[PDB]
Amino acid sequence: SRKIMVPPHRMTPLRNSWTKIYPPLVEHLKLQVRMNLKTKSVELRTNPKFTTDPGALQKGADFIKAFTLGFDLDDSIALLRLDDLYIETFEVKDVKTLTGDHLSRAIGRIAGKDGKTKFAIENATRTRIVLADSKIHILGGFTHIRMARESVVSLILGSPPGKVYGNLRTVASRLKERY
RNA sequence: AGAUUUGGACAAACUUGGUCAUUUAGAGGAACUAAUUCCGUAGGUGAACCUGCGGAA
């Protein structure tokens, strides 16, 4: 009985995959939903013959929110197999700073060498970071989201590059090793 | 109206020695020192799409 409104940041990308991801979720979960592009929002509800999971409407809404927020179909496939996964859409002005020239320098600091720092922080800390100009939709495990959250508040607050690059090395070891 | 001769000093430059001063030459004398995506959207790109502007979510 939920409704997810797709924004303009994934409009035609969802239009190309209008039936590419629709047939997979209908096969696995069978949620009653249609491409109601008149209001630019899709309402998903439990079907009368396939309501065997109360969380299937919640899990499909998270994958619909993943496609709306910009996560790819590989993450949406991981959103289907989300027995241990979590998504937190922490945007800007949570760790608030100046929205003018300092935010542009923070955007350069988050990207690094044209997205190299964001790709390194995503790969080493084992997370998918959908970093917009202001929104950061991080997807991963409970320790992975926490390590993603602690790393992004480190760079906005001020730390040297050798401190954080040393830090993403050793937090990569601490979650990969469990005993 | 408008060539030559007659001698004075400035006397250049030079000769000759003297004078004082300046260096240094080859040596030998005693010391001292050192060793991202979705867009609209101009130029175009063989054409996709890129170089540009603006927005966002």
* A53: number of Cβ within 10 Å: 13
Cα separation, A56 vs A62, in Å, equals: 10
What distance in Å separates the CA atoms of residue A73 and residue A69, rounded to the nearest whole number?
12
The alpha carbon dihedral of A70, A74, A76, A81 has a sign of negative
Question: How far is A139 from A64, CA to CA, in rounded Å?
Answer: 14
Count of CB atoms situated within 10 Å of the CB of A33: 22
> Nearest Cα to A133, choosing from A165, A157, A99, A164?
A99
Distance (Å) of CA A30 to CA A48, A51, A82, A179: 10, 8, 17, 40
Q: Residue type for A3, please?
A: K
Look at residue A120 and give its three-state secondary structure: helix
Q: Name the nearest CA neighbour of A163 among A174, A151, A172, A173.
A: A151
What the block records as the tokens of A148 is 């993603």
Distance (Å) from CA A63 to C1' B10? 119
Distance A29 CA to B37 C1' (A): 28
Beta strands at A31-32 and A41-46: parallel, antiparallel or unpaired: antiparallel
Rounded CA-CA distance A157/A176 in Å is 27
What Rg do the C-alpha atoms of chain A give, in angstroms?
18
Instruction: Decide: A29 and A54 in contact? Cβ < 8 Å.
Output: no
Q: Which tokens in the block code for residue A51?
A: 């309501």
Left (φ > 0), alpha (ψ -120 to 50) or beta: where does A87 sit?
A: beta
**For A10, which DSSP code?**
G
Cβ within 7 A of any strand B atom: A 7-13, 70, 111, 114-115, 118, 131-135
**Distance, Å, A37 CA → B33 C1':** 101
Nucleotide nearest to A135 (CA to C1'): B57
DSSP A176: H
* Spatial CA neighbour of A64 closest among A86, A79, A49, A81: A79
Q: What is the DSSP letter of A2?
A: E
Q: In chain A, how many H helices and how many E strands? A: 8, 6
CB distance A110 to A131 below 8 Å: yes
Using a 7 Å cut-off to protein CB atoms, list the covered nucleotides of chain B. Answer: 36-39, 55-57
Question: Whose C1' is closest to the CA of A134: which nucleotide?
Answer: B57
Q: In this structure, what token pair is assigned to residue A30?
A: 């069978």
CA-to-C1' span, A13 to B46 (A): 28
Q: What are the DSSP E strand ranges found in chain A? A: 2-5, 31-32, 41-46, 86-91, 128-131, 135-140
Q: Which two tokens stand for residue A123?
A: 């790969």
Reported structure resolution in angstroms: 4.0
Do A56 and A64 contact (CB within 8 A), yes or no? no
Q: How far apart are alpha carbons A3 and A31 in whole angstroms?
A: 12
